[model samples]
Target: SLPDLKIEKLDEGVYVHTSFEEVNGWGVVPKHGLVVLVNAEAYLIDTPFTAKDTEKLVTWFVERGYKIKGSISSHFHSESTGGIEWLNSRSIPTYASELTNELLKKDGKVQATNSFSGVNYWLVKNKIEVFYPGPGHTPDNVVVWLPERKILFGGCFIKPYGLGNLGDANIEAWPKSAKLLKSKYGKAKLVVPSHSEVGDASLLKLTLEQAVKGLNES
Candidate 1:
């Protein structure tokens, strides 16, 4: 049995929603997944919180005749990377930053309770061809940019509506991450944060400005 998950469309091909657990605050601790419907095939940005939720979400896509071509976890936290094993079982390709891969290799078994077993994947290096904006949140948070659609999956890197919790955050390097993201994908028409409603490119600009200002103030 799985908790009921709601799906809402943020744009024509982009969907945003949340799934919750009764014990957790809002089920937001786990990295919220984003579904991107592209002409080539559907791409899932992150996995759900639990195995059951991941299965439900994947089944929802398969039911709609969409095969997940690519799946990227924002980081190696259990909530974000928990479903990598499930996706791997389906032969879906999983992507993450090089630093993320390294971290996973080092402490995945200990931190994630060994939940990511048998999940083989690749790292998205700093290449314009791949279009990943490079490390920010924990040295492996890469922004996924859809060039044709001009939509940037800013992930946990840039949250326009609110500030991100900085407990595990790299406070010093975050500003540089935002700068790189803005300079590279600043033209994006819509920016989707990992945990909030979608907004325009201006939101990205505003987020960067605010982050820089806050960094200076601190």
Candidate 2:
């Protein structure tokens, strides 16, 4: 099945694109990224799974004369930052939490060299400030906040309608991270998840509700 990269405008200068077909089994595991066009500078929330997909997004921005200022990976998942190499080739810096950086250092080189399936080294070359909200899908998971626009890229930590894959999730710490993220950027008008469709502030509330419900049930 061909991957469907559907793009939608979430708010002023904020756009989200989702590739649902790329998900292996769970239809809920959609791959998404956010494009923030600020003063003609483009900031990507996350990159897709393939270099081709990443190139397509980059081309879309470049055509409008907007170069990527920086990128933040919601997590260290390969699917989220698979196009790091492509972005780095253009000298675009990528940011992630310290735990993510450590995890990548151990797994990235091997994944990059062995898997021609990995991102470029330059993706991790420019380490911007990574604020650890706590733990969720992974200890390294962090939400990206754009204060100027009041936009929160929730990443894999908080899904809009459901929970992340608990197989590898740190359930005990997920709630705490979610709380911190909410206290920090819950006021955001636009909330973008790593997967699923983009939505408004209420979306965060809805996600929190779901997480709370799930936790209570478990």
Candidate 3:
């Protein structure tokens, strides 16, 4: 229960922070972010809600004898971008999609010092691929793909099935984006949604339908 970081061990070295991050009026939502450990080095997927939460996460890993490599935000939203400055202060680089970085910069956040576009990968024994498969939830939304493991971190781009409203989206573009993802990582064994629970690839398919259904209702 840190930042309420309820850590869930995924594989041998990987973990997930099934935690909460505050929103202006939304209160706290269950944010399922990742923790990737490779060798003695580790990186955080997204940060906890605040400096205290981020510090707690860092301390947890530091106590476990890990070298904090960096932090990567999957999108520009506060759930992913919040507490990023905490990493910046520690001189640990914060990364995001190029579009996310630009959007965040426009929003005037002291975060995401490193940015890239299209696709990027991290090294361990295998590579953790970060890709921008068009857009769904937001124009800069991206999916974190662990190819060797077949786990796709689908952030808000892929929400829980029957999630009602899609929160923020370019309704017209969502179907195309979701379909593109379905085609790209259709073989993924697990899909971890940011706002909802982790699910199989069906969640992606459901999101495509839900996006359309939501638009129809709106």
In model 1, pairs of residues that clash are none
> Each candidate's lDDT (Cα)?
0.62, 0.66, 0.77
- Root mean square deviation (Cα) for candidate 3: 2.4
| lDDT, candidate 2, 79-177, per-residue tens | 676777777776777665555666677775212212111122232223222346677777767665666567767777767667857765676776666
lDDT for 105 (candidate 3): 80
Clashing pairs in 2: 85-120
Q: TM-scores across all candidates?
A: 0.76, 0.78, 0.89
Clashing pairs in 3: 2-5
Alpha-carbon deviation at 55 in model 1, angstroms: 0.7
lDDT of 1 by residue, 7-102 (tens): 767667777645554335444342456777766366667666666777888778778888877667767665566667777776777765555666
Candidate with top lDDT is 3
Could you say which candidate leads in TM-score?
3
Model 1 misplaced stretches (Cα beyond 4 Å): 1-3, 21-31, 109-135
Off by over 4 Å in 3: 1-3, 22-27, 119-126, 162-167
Better of 1 and 2 by TM-score: 2
Task: List, in order, the clash count of every candidate structure.
Answer: 0, 1, 1
User: For model 2, where is the 10-residue window of minimal lDDT?
Assistant: 110-119
Candidates in descending TM-score order:
3, 2, 1
